[PDB]
Design a protein around this ligand. Structure first.
Ligand SMILES: CCN(CC)c1ccc2c(c1)Oc1cc(N(CC)CC)ccc1C2c1ccccc1C(=O)OCCOCCn1cc(CO[C@@H]2O[C@@H](C)[C@@H](O)[C@@H](O)[C@@H]2O)nn1
Ligand SMILES: CCN(CC)c1ccc2c(c1)Oc1cc(N(CC)CC)ccc1C2c1ccccc1C(=O)OCCOCCn1cc(CO[C@@H]2O[C@@H](C)[C@@H](O)[C@@H](O)[C@@H]2O)nn1
Ligand SMILES: CCN(CC)c1ccc2c(c1)Oc1cc(N(CC)CC)ccc1C2c1ccccc1C(=O)OCCOCCn1cc(CO[C@@H]2O[C@@H](C)[C@@H](O)[C@@H](O)[C@@H]2O)nn1
Length: 256
């Protein structure tokens, strides 16, 4: 089946969903007025994405992978351009300049490349895995990162909280992760052999979430309005991606 990556921003919000299909990555966009096909169009068998706002202007980084080569595509308001980033599965997160962290699963090994505003360098993360997802949150200036590494049917959470990578309490399969607030609350979606289920953290242990829908692949994005969380899960079977919406139960979204 296809596989997707999703990012969102702003008050509307705007959403961008990238789809790797038959060697080509395309983009579908929401700006509150219906879904439309965006301008991003590049080769790749795997895609991950991150984005940040500068004022009212979105900046987007899309990581497109073919074989072992990952190309970074940059939206900074004037067309898509090839970024400096130097088969594989990737997952990406960013915070703040910005700083960016890209995790790559390659032949059972997950490694990490980092952007700090100066150049790309190889981060400390090395753990086994065939599938990878990631989420992060700031507590002040302090980044906290959670990487979900999957091998077979086991998914291992790895935690960055300022002083090394520690194995998390979380309990190949393909995952997608999002988080919100300062506790934080986390939600991890896992596509396992045709079905997507949910595991949740609210600061006091992991438990089964209410989301349960079919799909071979999953991506996710979320935003806060005040303290209310809104979540969009993109579940794909074949070339069909269904959007599932949490806005306070889960309802089928308008995405096509
Ligand atoms: C870009 C337009 N302007 C004019 C208003 C601008 C805006 C912000 C900065 C600006 C300039 O400069 C600096 C400089 C520093 N320094 C001094 C050298 C370090 C202490 C610090 C903060 C700001 C910052 C800055 C300060 C606070 C918060 C964010 C930034 C920033 O956007 O940051 C943008 C900085 O970009 C300059 C360096 N740069 C940017 C890139 C772009 O790279 C692309 O984008 C990257 C994010 C990656 O994806 C990369 O692979 C890809 O190729 N390559 N080199
Ligand atoms: C009774 C249990 N203990 C001690 C035995 C405890 C309790 C509370 C804290 C404790 C410890 O430590 C801290 C530390 C900090 N700092 C200092 C600046 C940050 C480095 C701040 C507050 C407290 C807090 C804290 C104080 C007030 C309000 C909230 C917290 C808190 O939950 O905060 C979280 C601390 O642990 C308590 C509950 N908790 C946190 C985790 C973190 O777990 C990881 O991170 C999670 C988000 C998930 O990824 C999870 O799977 C992964 O294992 N597991 N249980
Ligand atoms: C003025 C009174 N009317 C029309 C007579 C009205 C207004 C709002 C809703 C209304 C009705 O009905 C629903 C019904 C549901 N349910 C039941 C749980 C399932 C369908 C949920 C929410 C509302 C909403 C609703 C609640 C909160 C936020 C937005 C909306 C909305 O859809 O419209 C507000 C206008 O905002 C711009 C137009 N808009 C927003 C959306 C939300 O779309 C979803 O969310 C987007 C972010 C995307 O992910 C998209 O694919 C997905 O379908 N659709 N159209």
């Amino acid at each position: 089946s296809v596989q997707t990556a999703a990012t969102s921003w702003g008050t509307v919000p705007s959403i961008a969903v990238y789809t790797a299909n038959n060697g080509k990555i395309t983009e579908r966009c929401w700006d509150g007025k219906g879904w439309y096909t965006g301008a991003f169009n590049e080769p790749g068998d795997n895609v991950s994405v991150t984005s940040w706002l500068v004022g009212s202007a979105i900046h987007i980084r899309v990581y497109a992978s073919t074989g072992t080569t990952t190309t970074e595509w940059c939206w900074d308001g004037n067309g898509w351009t090839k970024g400096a980033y130097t088969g594989d599965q990737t997952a990406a997160t960013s915070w703040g300049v910005p700083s960016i962290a890209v995790y790559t699963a390659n032949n059972g090994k997950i490694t990490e490349r980092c952007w700090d505003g100066k150049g790309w360098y190889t981060g400390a993360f090395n753990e086994p895995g065939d599938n990878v997802s990631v989420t992060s949150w700031l507590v002040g200036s302090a980044i906290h990162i959670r990487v979900y590494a999957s091998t077979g049917t086991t998914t291992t959470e790895w935690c960055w909280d300022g002083n090394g990578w520690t194995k998390g309490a979380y309990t190949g399969d393909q995952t997608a992760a999002t988080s919100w607030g300062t506790v934080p609350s986390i939600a991890v979606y896992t596509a396992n052999n045709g079905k997507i289920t949910e595991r949740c953290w609210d600061g006091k242990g992991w438990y089964t979430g209410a989301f349960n829908e079919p799909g071979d692949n999953v991506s996710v994005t979320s935003w806060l309005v005040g303290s209310a969380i809104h979540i969009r899960v993109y579940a794909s079977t074949g070339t069909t991606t269904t959007e599932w919406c949490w806005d306070g139960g889960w309802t089928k979204g308008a995405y096509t």
